Amino acid sequence: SSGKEQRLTSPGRLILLCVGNNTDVVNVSVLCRWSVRLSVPSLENPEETTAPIMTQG
Amino acid sequence: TNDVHLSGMSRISQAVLPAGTGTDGYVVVDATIVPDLLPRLGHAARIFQRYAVETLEFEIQPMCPANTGGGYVAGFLPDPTDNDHTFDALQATRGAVVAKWWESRTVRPQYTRTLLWTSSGKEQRLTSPGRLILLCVGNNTDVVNVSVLCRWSVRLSVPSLENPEETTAPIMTQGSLYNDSLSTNDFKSILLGSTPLDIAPDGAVFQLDRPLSIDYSLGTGDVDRAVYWHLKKFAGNAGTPAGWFRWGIWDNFNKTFTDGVAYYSDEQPRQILLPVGTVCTRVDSE
Amino acid sequence: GTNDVHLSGMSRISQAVLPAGTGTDGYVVVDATIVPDLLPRLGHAARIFQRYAVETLEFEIQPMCPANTGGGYVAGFLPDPTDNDHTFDALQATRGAVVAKWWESRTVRPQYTRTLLWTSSGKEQRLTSPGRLILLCVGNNTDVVNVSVLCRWSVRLSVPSLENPEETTAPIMTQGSLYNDSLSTNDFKSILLGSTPLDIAPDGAVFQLDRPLSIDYSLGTGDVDRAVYWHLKKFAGNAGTPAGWFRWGIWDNFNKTFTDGVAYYSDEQPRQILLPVGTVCTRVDSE
Amino acid sequence: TNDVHLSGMSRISQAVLPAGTGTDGYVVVDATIVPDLLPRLGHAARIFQRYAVETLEFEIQPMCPANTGGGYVAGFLPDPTDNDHTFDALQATRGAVVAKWWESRTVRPQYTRTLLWTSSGKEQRLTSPGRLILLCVGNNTDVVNVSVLCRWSVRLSVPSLENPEETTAPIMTQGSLYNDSLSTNDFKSILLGSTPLDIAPDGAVFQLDRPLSIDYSLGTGDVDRAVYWHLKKFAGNAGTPAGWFRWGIWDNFNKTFTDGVAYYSDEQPRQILLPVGTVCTRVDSE
Amino acid sequence: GTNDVHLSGMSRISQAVLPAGTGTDGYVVVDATIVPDLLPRLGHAARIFQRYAVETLEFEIQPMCPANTGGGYVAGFLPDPTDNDHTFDALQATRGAVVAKWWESRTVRPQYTRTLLWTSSGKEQRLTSPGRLILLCVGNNTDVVNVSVLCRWSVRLSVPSLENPEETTAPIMTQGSLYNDSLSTNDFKSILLGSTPLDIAPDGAVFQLDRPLSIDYSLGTGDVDRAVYWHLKKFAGNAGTPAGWFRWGIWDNFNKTFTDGVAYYSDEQPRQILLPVGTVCTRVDSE
Amino acid sequence: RTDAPVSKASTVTGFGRGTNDVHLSGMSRISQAVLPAGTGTDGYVVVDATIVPDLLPRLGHAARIFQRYAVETLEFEIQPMCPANTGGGYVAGFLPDPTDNDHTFDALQATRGAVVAKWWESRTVRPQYTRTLLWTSSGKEQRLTSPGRLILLCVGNNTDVVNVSVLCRWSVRLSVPSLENPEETTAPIMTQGSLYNDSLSTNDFKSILLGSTPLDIAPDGAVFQLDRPLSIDYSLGTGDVDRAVYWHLKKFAGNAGTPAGWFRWGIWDNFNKTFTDGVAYYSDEQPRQILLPVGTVCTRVDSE
Ligand SMILES: [Ca+2]
Ligand SMILES: [Ca+2]
Ligand SMILES: [Ca+2]
Ligand SMILES: [Ca+2]
Ligand SMILES: [Ca+2]
Ligand SMILES: [Ca+2]
Question: Superkingdom of the source (chains B, D) (predicted)?
């Protein structure tokens, strides 16, 4: 369930930046291979499970 | 060591649900667990900043005649953030129990068991191990006077002196307040969808984390806008059991409430004033 | 030495000057909320890693004044950073708390819970800060006291990162209710909020709010409109009012500059609270 | 102990050498190794006075299409004093590498491994273990955007607070400035023969360790002499890629530049103004 | 006992007197760059050997003043002799650094890297000096403070030599830019450079420069010539200007005497810097 | 059977793997003097040689391939040639600081190894030296490129001509592989004499005036460069006093009448390896000026 502090619901974020100027079209895809263990039994409505987003403008 | 262990058994809360009121789903206690709510621990917590839960059990204790023939479900939800009182949510928890109104039962929850703070803060996952909800499962035939007891043991860690108006649990709205639901000076508590607010005594004062905007007029056909951050509970009675809230100004030094400006509705567009998830701390002394 | 380092140092936390006779029982002389940035050598290290955990804290008071001054103070470390109760009894409750004469240095040696913290500030503050050192008077000071507070610290920095110099300063909770009675058309007094971090903030400073500042205005025509501002800017106080004043408006962010954008209307309105106790004022300006 | 070990990987520098520019010899990065240049270490060094190098490797990382068909040579010269960017000088060092522009390579230098200072000083053999130079070996067909990465570990020794304008590496001139090469108000950066100066951003201010003498006139046919110690870089563009320098006065308190007097040439004898080996520290904040 | 000796002693580094009310936050009261000669018993030993390495350093502050004085100071040992940043925060960063009231003696106990040094001074100064002790104010001093700074040292002298008494004194880096606006025809103010070693240097003193002092002049005829001087001489300051003044010219070296050789022209010229920040002024006079 | 790529990969294999160390040794004459009878008054500093690979010829060349060197053994021999009836005395010793400029009998005897003897006897000076690793390329600090200097002073007055020769027997280990141009491998030299603009000629000046034992016995056509600028007072030709700034000198050989020689200022154009001469000094009623102060560092820049 999402909360007020994000440091508690996400382990961090994956960012990818350009390093030069591409001469051509670039088709990048970024795959995450995960394994995780779910600990506590409960029923959480899908409205609260979403991640919060901060504007930067 | 500097740490202090403390254990006791204490009434978390007591509801009376009268004859015939109440129907499957009807939330009859919704209590966010924090030391203030646990009587003897209440005072111990006022001394340190940090507590950690060592043991927690709730013993349900309902009082009615043997022929009462209703029912309840109880349980403990570990997420003080999770705001979902449905039976399905409860039945999903560990500890959860069901019984007839005349039967006591003991819920044995699973809880955080880690180091928490005594005084309230932004993220309330650090102030509480969870919350206990008890609901109706049928229609109660008779008056039941349910008293839920909690046997608890805790570890208190760093010494401190704590402001008692800070120790209280923040209450969250469950329902939106629309501008078209305001009376001239007040509105019905039930709109906010919150049992703890609905049962907060007469004269409780609450500060909001979101502004309450009140459109008013000088009486010239001219609409103006005011802002308020405080509400006062005006007690509920048989006709309006949830009671009412007046907006206004809380003076924190003098500890006094002043009612705010009258609402004037004049062909305004539909608006959301207090969205669901508005937070409401008790700021008045107890 | 890839991920963990121990650093120790000591560093000035804050300096205050009490004019003669200023201050009284309970006058708050310094409320310093702790964060790696505020302590100088450390702040550089906390920019390298994004996690830190405190291992020793100690504060030395070192107030300087003549031997005759004869007022008093009390200092302590208050481990909740959330805790805004600045009463004497609540300060003396803190472990290590010391009370002495203005011409006596002392050393407060507290206990803290030694959790892992974050360097970059986020929403919940008990995850970015071990607490806040408070110092307050206990009598009238007879002479000018130029008090410096030092902090001896050792700390363990943990996760390699490179932070941006903007996110590191910790926000400020307002302590007092700002009524609209107290407004002036261009600006308002700092002391009204009652937060000593705001009261001391240097001029040309800009603070973003978490709640909206609602400004009344009119171009003319005897007509009252209503406007909204999320920012504040500090304009330095003068001997008459040391508090300083706050001017609202617009902090263009791409710009790197403030625009006052303040219009007010003083009229017969019903008394209102624009920015209530608990309003969170983050420092947004250039650094 | 009081000593602090620190390790990381960090971009030492990044050049773009565009299409067709650049020819065997063309120095594309010349970076004097000091902690300021290494980003994360940059901040750690601002705290102590002394650092010592434990490990150093540079990983070259060029970015271009596979068909680029130029080439480079890289290496690490251990003498921060030695001022010789030729291929032959590089090929003599240990670690040195050569490759096509599309290939990354890792230079493994040998370095002092002894105790050095964080802040700059007269003898720069105590501030730096050496310098890495990367040159062209052919003519590059395409745009290459080379990003040279350095994996480093160091030991930092005595705590201190360091003025950041002092931490920077002094740049040395490679070519003499002659009086007859001055324009009325400026001169071309390329004359000084220094890549780090040539690529220093617009508005960089530098102090010289040698006086810049400017002959001027009042406009009476009377030649007079002025002295200046500061230069301001005015950015280079496609027409003049090295850019230009104006002499003048740097005000250290206000952190401002004032342009100096115009140069007047009037049948003067040949003169050397700024001999090769003139030292040029960055004084302006970054 | 042919080559190595241990010596320990303690010795006065410097004395300063602050007139009443002189000094303010950050006023630099004493900047003493350490060298065997400055410490008296040692200086005699360092004449015998040509290599020395420091094993313990400790400074005791001992300022003398009335109990009421009530300003403050901060003192520390700054191990780079090259470091010219004299800010408070930069001094408090130094290990062992102490802050106290003007009527409190203190002891600064630092860490130093304990390298082998040279006794005879040469170009790079981090090979002749372990660093420099700095002391500066932290408030306005109410009374006259007559501060003495002591230094307790133990050191290891290593290579047998016999030095000449002229090479042993360490040179001085100028801190401030000397504009030609500030010139007077016969002399200039010492405070403009901002180097406390220069500001304090006793009169009749002679200092050679590493950069050229460019003096404008004219015999007459409304004609501006240009001249060059490498030297300076100190002429004592007076209560009105404590800084003192510097008079350029010629230090005949066979002579053992100064010759002013100063000519100036004050005219409409474009503002210039004759001696910029970092100018090295070596003490050349007789000893 | 491999496919055709867009680009093959580099195959530049053995690169950056050059020979690393070399021990190397020999014995080299480090100076020679001849003193006619009257000269050689007590204390006359007959010799003063700052030790640097370049002074030891064979070594000097090897040193242009490595960046460091460290001394493994040194001794000096003294070996004056003169007959038994010469009644003068000398004193030699190696000063382990290359910067130390005070040459007194007292300051030598103080040095470990130092020797004292009448002119007709040979002597070996077994000195004390750093045995750490210095640099081959010259630098700003001398303490880092030289282990010290060997000085030899007269002790009485020679009755007769003295033919002293001073040989240095060395062994050294060269540490770091690199390529160092012969311009930077030269040793810097400090003047010990002020140059006044009253003591001048239109285009040159005396070398004894600078008061430096090296610059005195420096060779012909030898272009130098300075750290400090030189101020030359020239003219437009209207009785006008203008100012000129030159950085470079040129050595011209000396005489039996003028032991040391001349020094013509000018311009060392390094791009093209040539030397222009400096403008006609304007003699004038100009205030007395020290053009180059005591301690001016002069570093040789022309091709060696
Ligand atoms: Ca949940
Ligand atoms: Ca608390
Ligand atoms: Ca972070
Ligand atoms: Ca330093
Ligand atoms: Ca010496
Ligand atoms: Ca070299």
Answer: Viruses
Distance CA D114, CA D94 (A): 18
Residues of chain A with C-beta less than 8 angstroms from the C-beta of D63: 19-20
Solved using: X-ray
CA–CA dist B17, B23 (Å, integer): 11
Q: Find chain A residues with C-beta within 8 A of C118's C-beta.
A: 7
Cα gap C191→C240, rounded to integer Å: 13
Q: In A, which residues are within 8 Å of C123 by CB distance?
A: 4-6
Residue type, B218: L
Q: Is C50 marked as a binding-site residue?
A: yes
Residues with CB under 5 A from ligand 3 (ion): C 50, 120
Select the residue from C101, C146, C154 to test the E interface by mutation, using most E Cβ atoms within 10 A: C146
Phi, psi angle pair for C53, to nearest 5°: -140, 135
Give the separation between CA F248 and CA F230, rounded to whole angstroms: 8
Query: B122: distance to nearest CA of chain A, Å?
Result: 7
Residue with tokens 């920012």: C231
Q: How far is CA F263 from CA F165, F208, F270, in A?
A: 27, 10, 19
Query: Which residue, among E202, E148, E172, E163, has the nearest Cα to E43 in the 3D structure?
Result: E163
Neighbours of chain D (3+ CB pairs under 8 A): A, C, E, F
User: Checking DSSP bridges between strand E132-137 and strand E72-78, what pairing results, if any?
Assistant: antiparallel
- For chain C, report the end-to-end CA distance as a whole number of angstroms: 30
- Taking CA–CA distances from D208, the nearest residue in chain E reads E276
Tokens representing F280 are 């006609």
At residue F244, the 3 state secondary structure works out as: strand
Q: For residue A40, how many other CB atoms are within 10 A of its CB?
A: 11
Which candidate, A19, A51, A13, places its Cα nearest to that of A32?
A13
How far is ligand 6, taken at its centre, from the CA of residue D133, in Å?
A: 15
Would you list the DSSP string of chain D?
Answer: ---EEEEEEEEEEEEEE-TT---TT-EEEEEE--GGGSHHHHHHHTTBSEEEEEEEEEE------TT----EEEEEES-TT-----HHHHHTSSS-EEE-TT---EE------SEEESS--SSTTTT-S-EEEEEESS--SS-EEEEEEEEEEEEE-SB----HHHHSPPEE-SSPEEGGG--SS-EEGGGG--HHHHTSPTT-EEEEEEEEEEEEE-SSS-EEEEEEEEEEEE---SSSTT-EEEEEEEETTTTEEEE-PPP--SSPPP-EEE-TT-EEEE-S--
* C-alpha B188: how far from chain center: 16
Beta bridge partners of D29: D134
Are F18 and D100 inside 8 Å of each other by CB? no
What letter does residue F177 receive in the DSSP assignment?
B
